[PDB]
Design a protein around this nucleic acid. Structure first.
Lengths: 368, 905, 364
DNA sequence: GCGCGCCGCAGACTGTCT
DNA sequence: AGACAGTCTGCGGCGCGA
């Protein structure tokens, strides 16, 4: 309620219409705001760094979906099995990963609707059909990754479940205030999918485990990124866990996103001066902080100057890590005001140290 | 037969006597403090052909069982006793591993020692792994230095295999290796980690000195601080703390044994170990010679004071223990360390978030009305059409180069100005190598971790200034019970009246469940802390001991044929073993003491690494067959009860119940009576065990202080009726005349085997005013003697009937054996017969030769692949069956059939 | 000359022999390989530089991604998709984001579905086009259009190794007032890569009712009707520009944006073991943006023979010597770019000089 | 019940910064 | 010629090995 109108006010959500519950979860939402496209760029890159480039085995699958719209993102990955095992190196263990947009049928309002979900799918080629330790390794990796960047990592739980033919699998859940919602699923497809896709010959499906050719098992790990973003927004602000009066008498609306997942980091400003020469040094600082990986919010372009409390509340609701305010004193001394999202106190620091301190802060937040 | 729910006498049924003038007194006593009208439905009858006994009596049967084995070991001990060793060989050499030294120093290379009796010790370098570094093997024939091939520069880079010494001479005999802490030595013998059994057995001089003339925990402290309250100082000189250079002058007598002040083995460089060889060899040789002389002094005394062979055979059996790991030990350590680090980072991040939320105050002076953050500092201080690429970068460069002008200092003296002082203290300086973001370097040991989370103890400052541990934070014009209640504490502190005196060692790890002590009313980040602390407390306490346990990985050649070509066999994985390093006597009560294993760990939830007991996994083709003995200390106290006032397990109300009573239904007296008289929220077991050991009223009162908010005067006047009701006093349901009468008796302490108490607690020239340790020793040593009676059995059952196994593991009133998968039912039946024979033996020594059927057999004999409290249990980790294969276990309460143990059927 | 089977040995089983000039300009084809996907991601990042650096109040948007759109209610499986209608739907919200400052734009990289007709039927295109909508005041429409044409021409020629062939044509004006089209000269002539259309207020006034309340954002203290000029680009490839000709150089692709041929980790240990001498370069994967192909996992010395011809196929820009000769001295780097220079590696040629020569080329 | 480690915390001096 | 950053150093407590 209050969180959603806070999001649409600062455009981390799509639009005013169809804003109620289980409409964004279904995927029939209009979209995301200008700041909402970010954290879908911060996510699907942290996932990509954690899964694809860090693991020497994991390689991106061929572009899927070049009739019926795609829904599982798994069929095309198995379709590109033949080209995955390259001639120069036909190593069985390494697998495929992809991040894309999937289309789902939605019923119960009548006409059938189409829900849009950003899905990250990793298909793993376990060389033994009964190893089951690669699943545990991937579960540990996914769980520690979701608990990473989380203000309250305890809300990310896992549940064991089984289906027909008794496939073994795990379903990650996030504890939203209304209830637990499914985020990521690990499933042993059990090689029957490969046999169904390729019933002609079995010789092509053999891969080299060690020295011997064996038929692999495929493990599907499919997570959703739109509901993951909703989980990250709900982890920040408050999920009605605290409530109470004496716990937090202060009334501050702040979105404590992780520094490595925050959409825009630093917000430039102009104040306490009518000279208008500060726009020049703010543009210079704007050009300086870019090409270092830091995305800046040009709040200095605005002609109107609102109150500092409203600006700070706006930047907190926009998940601004650090607020830079450039006075006329910066023309004389070079000292700029810096305010932190975590601590409301502000300090004066030199402009030369700003970029180095910000990149060091982002790097150390990434490491920790 | 059906008098008290007893069974027929399978053995020794020639003479039966019910007694006279005893049933009337028993019935009259059981009229009071007991309903006595229980129907007591019988257990279904079990009748089987037992293996043929010897001597026509069970005591003589166990005597011949314990004398058939441990006779070559006894003669080897006698040959080592009778030897008159040469003093020392002056010449020490590397000589590529083993070499032989006669009376004089002479170098000759020999492969292995061909000697039966041997005294051996191993010194290791803690700097370089757990690999052995120095060893000498003294024998009546030669001197046998080992040297651990340390001259070679190249190491194995962990994964220990074939590196240590060897002592087994191979078939193509019996060996009693003596040593000081011979379990740590046993870790370095090699072929002890082999899955197949070895004839070699080990005797510990520490177990000898602890069994006879040992010191109780209080006694050891007094002897240390002294190298009513006052008594005769005879036990001070008679006993010692079990460290050598203190036992040697006690038994042998002479100059004190040398002690190297440098201590190169524990805190020395590798190159420091490589040279200075001869002095370290001389110190090790003197150590082993002193151990030999102490054993030579102790062996006839131990044989005289512990005459019955079951005790010696049980100690020899406990010398050999085997814990296989099945290559998942390294994975367990890695996941436990990763989980500990992750939860530590989570708790630190929660602390950072709380500190940042606290830093959001001071705007409008929102502090000093908060009861937690009022007393901190909170202070502030300050001291192309056209390419216009230039004028943007150039202005920034000019402002960067303008750093020197008007700068207060080139090196910043203001460490985050504008922040409060407590937040400045919690922040590392802006130097690049040591920078960490936010309020880092923050831990729970600091006084600023309190006052950030409430702790709900009204005003909880933890202001360690004349606090002395605790203050006015319990209960009841601000002096009365107020949420604030903290200003001018010195004139009117009141509060805790006992002041300091509590142990204060993880005291606040409990009392989080109720008992106030909730880290903030919110739920977001506060109460998440102090729950992470619960999870990581055990691993924080025990990660030194759990890690660095010595594991020797058996190669493919060392593995037997059962492991090879098994369905559960993997070529990539390498299987290993852990010797527990248990000392067969580490307390005056001769129960094994070891910190890592043999604890009350049963994979308890909300804990990180309490799955220590699990992952002791059998190799493929093997299984763990073992049973947790039912609650036995209560039974020992009950059987010490009967035949004193009357027989037939019916004299007292203690004897009447505790055996037909069940945990599922009715009252088993373990918790039900305690939770009826008192609160006893799961602590009933500790209270009952304290009553059984005779701790007394002050210990019970101090134990009950830590469990409820009960007043001292209220504790004396009320809820102390357990002592006044269970025990009539000093000469109802509990009686202590038998235990006290044993305690006053000098030599006949153990009723079963006749093992005498340590000479420190003997009444000869020593009077014990405290009185608790002797009766505690009687109960626990009777339990130990029961364990020895179990362990002497299950042998010659694996010999006369071809059963592979006999690797006992005793943790806490339970037994485990590494048996093959083909012989698990035979092992279960043998264990059931062993339990029946042991219970009949204990009853026969303490009176009559008839046993109730309820305690005559185990409830279930667990056959598993790992070690756990119950077959239907899993560890707290997210996935126990996933990954490592688990068969989920079977109970095996009832055997497969009535068929006998021999292979033909 | 075909470059799809000779130079592009790494390909897909589907239509392996059916690859020609047709069906590659159109979207009716099997998807791109891992190298193609990573090159598309790199090109998308280089296009997104025009979103993060040329920040004239330009913001990202996301379309609903539906092939027909958000259904068809109340009006008398689609002709084309252009990511433009989503921008005009997000006009109100993104104008509310600013204080109604009109010179702002919305950009988006997404999948556009185009039906394929008269194949030499009704196939899905998925041509992964990139759009910029650039809401502009009507008076400066021509200047802003020329501005965007100039920067798009500069950006597309920035990665071009050869002069010309990124032609710009005025063509005609039927959809709007005026426009320009960018044509890349393949050997099968010039085909469209990017187009400009000065749409005007017609589409925005058509989608919304006649009465205006949230429109006409202020510029120069006067509320004026907003003009729209759309920049639409098909994310095609410069692989034909990479291999201009073979001649004596035998079939080499110059790595202007290639994820491979600027990489590391190959060598797998010189003495058939202890691969941490090369695998220990994995720190280039953390905190950097260097893509590294794990050739060391191949560990097939038989396939590594004929080093001159193996550099044609594998090309990880260096290799460790197989013979145990130069394990010491801390240098393994060799065959950098065209000529082997063989210098030290710890701080000179690994984690440094790889970040360099790319950012300098980016600035040029 | 003790003793020797490892952290927190408050000195009393030390050393530039003025 | 003051005065407040930091560097050992003497206190309390926690805690683990016998």
């Amino acid at each position: 309620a209050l969180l959603e109108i806070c999001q649409r006010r600062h455009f981390l959500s799509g639009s005013k219409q169809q804003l109620s519950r289980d409409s964004l979860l279904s995927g029939c939402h209009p979209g995301f705001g200008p700041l909402g496209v970010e954290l879908r760029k911060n996510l699907a890159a942290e996932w990509w760094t954690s899964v694809v480039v860090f693991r020497e085995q994991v390689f991106p699958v061929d572009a899927l979906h070049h009739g019926k719209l795609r829904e599982n993102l798994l069929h095309g990955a198995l379709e590109h099995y033949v080209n995955c095992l390259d001639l120069v190196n036909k190593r069985l263990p390494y697998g495929l990963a992809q991040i894309g947009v999937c289309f789902h049928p939605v019923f119960d309002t009548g006409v059938k609707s189409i829900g849009e979900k950003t899905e990250a799918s990793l298909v793993w080629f376990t060389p033994p059909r009964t190893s089951n330790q690669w699943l545990d390794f991937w579960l540990r990796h996914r769980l520690q990754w979701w608990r990473k960047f989380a203000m309250s990592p305890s809300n990310f739980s896992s549940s064991d479940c089984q289906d027909e033919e008794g496939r073994k699998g795990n379903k990650l859940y996030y504890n939203f205030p209304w209830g637990k919602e499914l985020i990521e699923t690990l499933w042993n497809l059990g090689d029957h999918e490969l046999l169904h896709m390729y019933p002609g010959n079995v010789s092509k499906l053999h891969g080299r485990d060690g020295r011997k050719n064996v038929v692999p098992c495929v493990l599907s790990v499919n997570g959703d990124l739109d509901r993951g973003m909703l989980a990250y927004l709900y982890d920040s602000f408050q999920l009605t866990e605290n409530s109470f009066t004496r716990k937090k008498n202060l009334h501050r609306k702040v979105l404590k996103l992780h520094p490595c997942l925050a959409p825009i980091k630093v917000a430039l400003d102009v104040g306490r001066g009518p000279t208008l020469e500060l726009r020049q040094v703010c543009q210079g600082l704007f050009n300086e902080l870019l090409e270092n990986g830091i995305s800046v919010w040009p709040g200095y372009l605005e002609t109107m100057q609102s109150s500092l409390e409203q600006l700070y509340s706006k930047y907190d609701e926009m998940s601004i890590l650090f607020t830079v305010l450039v006075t006329e004193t910066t023309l004389e001394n070079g000292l700029i005001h810096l305010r932190s999202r975590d601590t409301t106190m502000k300090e004066m620091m030199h402009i030369s140290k700003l970029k180095d301190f910000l990149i060091k802060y982002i790097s150390s937040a990434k490491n920790v | 037969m059906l008098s008290r729910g007893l069974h027929e006498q399978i053995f020794g049924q020639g003479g039966e006597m019910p007694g006279e003038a005893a049933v009337r007194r028993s019935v009259e006593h059981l009229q009071k403090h007991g309903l006595w009208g229980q129907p007591a439905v019988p257990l279904p009858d079990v009748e089987l052909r037992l293996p043929p006994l010897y001597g026509d009596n069970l005591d003589q049967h166990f005597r011949l069982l314990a004398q058939k084995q441990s006779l070559p070991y006894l003669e080897a001990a006698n040959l080592l006793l009778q030897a008159q060793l040469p003093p020392k060989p002056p010449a020490w050499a590397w000589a590529e591993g083993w070499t032989r030294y006669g009376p004089e120093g002479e170098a000759v290379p020999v492969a292995i020692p061909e000697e039966r009796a041997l005294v051996f010790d191993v010194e290791v370098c803690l700097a370089e792994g757990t690999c052995p570094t120095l060893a000498v093997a003294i024998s009546p024939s030669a001197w046998y230095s080992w040297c651990s091939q340390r001259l070679v520069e190249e190491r194995y880079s962990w994964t220990s295999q074939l590196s240590p010494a060897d002592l087994i001479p191979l078939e193509v005999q019996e060996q009693l290796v003596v040593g000081h802490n011979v379990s740590f030595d046993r870790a370095h013998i090699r072929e002890q980690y082999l899955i197949q059994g070895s004839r070699m057995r080990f005797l510990d001089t520490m177990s000898m000195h602890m069994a006879i003339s040992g010191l109780s925990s209080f006694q050891r402290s007094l002897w240390i601080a002294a190298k009513p309250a006052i008594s005769s100082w005879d036990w001070l000189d008679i006993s010692s703390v079990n460290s050598l250079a203190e036992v040697h002058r006690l038994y042998v007598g002479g100059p004190p044994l040398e002690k190297e002040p440098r201590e190169l083995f524990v805190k020395g460089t590798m190159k420091d170990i490589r040279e200075n060889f001869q002095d370290l060899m001389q110190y090790c040789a003197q150590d082993v010679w002193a151990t030999h002389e102490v054993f030579q002094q102790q062996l006839p005394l131990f044989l005289e004071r512990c005459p019955h062979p079951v005790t010696l055979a049980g100690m020899l059996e406990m010398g050999v223990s085997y814990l296989p790991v099945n290559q998942n030990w390294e994975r367990y350590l890695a996941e436990a360390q990763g989980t500990y680090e992750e939860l530590q980072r989570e708790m630190k991040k929660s602390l950072m978030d709380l500190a940042n939320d606290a830093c959001q105050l001071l705007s409008g002076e929102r502090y000093k009305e908060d009861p937690w953050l009022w007393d901190l500092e909170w202070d502030l201080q300050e001291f192309s059409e056209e390419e216009e690429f230039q004028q943007d970068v150039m202005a920034r460069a000019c402002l960067q180069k303008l750093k020197g002008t008007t700068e207060l200092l080139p090196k910043r003296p203001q460490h985050l100005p504008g922040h409060p002082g407590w937040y400045r203290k919690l922040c590392p300086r802006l130097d690049d190598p040591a920078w960490t973001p936010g309020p880092s370097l923050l831990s729970l040991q600091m006084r600023v971790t309190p006052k950030l989370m409430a702790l709900t103890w009204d005003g909880f400052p933890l202001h360690y200034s004349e606090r002395h541990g605790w203050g006015y934070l319990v209960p009841g014009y601000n002096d009365v019970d107020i949420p604030g209640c903290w200003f001018f504490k010195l004139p009117h502190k009141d509060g805790n009246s006992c002041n300091v005196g509590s142990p204060f060692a993880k005291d606040f790890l409990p009392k989080m469940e109720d008992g106030t002590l909730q880290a903030g009313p919110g739920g977001a980040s506060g109460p998440r802390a102090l729950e992470i602390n619960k999870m990581i407390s055990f691993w924080r306490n025990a990660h030194k001991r759990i890690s660095s346990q010595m594991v020797v990985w058996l190669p493919r050649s060392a593995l037997p044929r059962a492991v090879i070509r098994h369905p559960d066999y993997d070529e990539e994985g390498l299987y290993g073993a852990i010797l527990p390093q248990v000392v067969t006597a580490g307390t005056i009560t001769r129960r094994a003491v070891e910190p890592t294993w043999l604890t009350a760990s049963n994979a308890r939830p909300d804990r990180v690494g309490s799955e220590l007991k699990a992952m002791v996994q059998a190799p493929p083709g093997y299984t763990l067959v073992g049973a947790d003995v039912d609650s036995q200390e209560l039974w020992i106290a009950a059987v010490l009860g009967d035949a004193h006032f009357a027989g037939m397990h019916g004299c007292t109300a203690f004897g009447w119940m505790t055996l037909q009573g069940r945990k599922s239904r009715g009252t088993d007296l373990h918790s039900k009576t305690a939770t009826t008289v008192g609160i006893s929220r799961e602590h009933a077991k500790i209270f009952n065990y304290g009553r059984i050991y005779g701790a007394g009223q002050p210990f019970a009162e101090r134990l009950l202080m830590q469990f409820n908010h009960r007043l001292t005067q209220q504790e004396a006047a009320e809820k102390a009726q357990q002592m006044y009701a269970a025990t009539k006093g000093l000469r109802e349901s509990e009686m202590f005349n038998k235990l006290e009468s044993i305690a006053t008796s000098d030599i006949p302490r153990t009723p079963v085997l006749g093992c005498c108490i340590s000479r420190a607690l003997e009444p000869s020239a020593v009077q014990e005013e405290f009185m608790t340790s002797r009766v505690n020793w009687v109960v626990q040593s009777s339990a130990v003697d029961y364990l020895h009676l179990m362990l002497v059995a299950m042998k010659w059952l694996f010999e006369e009937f071809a059963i592979d196994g006999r690797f006992c593991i005793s943790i806490h009133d339970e037994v485990r054996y590494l048996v093959r998968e083909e012989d698990r039912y035979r092992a279960a039946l043998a264990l059931q017969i062993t339990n029946l024979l042991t219970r009949c033996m204990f009853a026969y020594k303490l009176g009559l030769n008839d046993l109730p059927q309820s305690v005559a057999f185990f409830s279930a004999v667990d056959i598993d692949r790992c070690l756990r409290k119950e077959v239907t249990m899993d560890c707290k980790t997210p996935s126990n069956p996933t990954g490592m294969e688990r068969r989920y276990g079977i109970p095996q309460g009832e055997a497969l059939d009535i068929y006998q143990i021999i292979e033909l059927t």
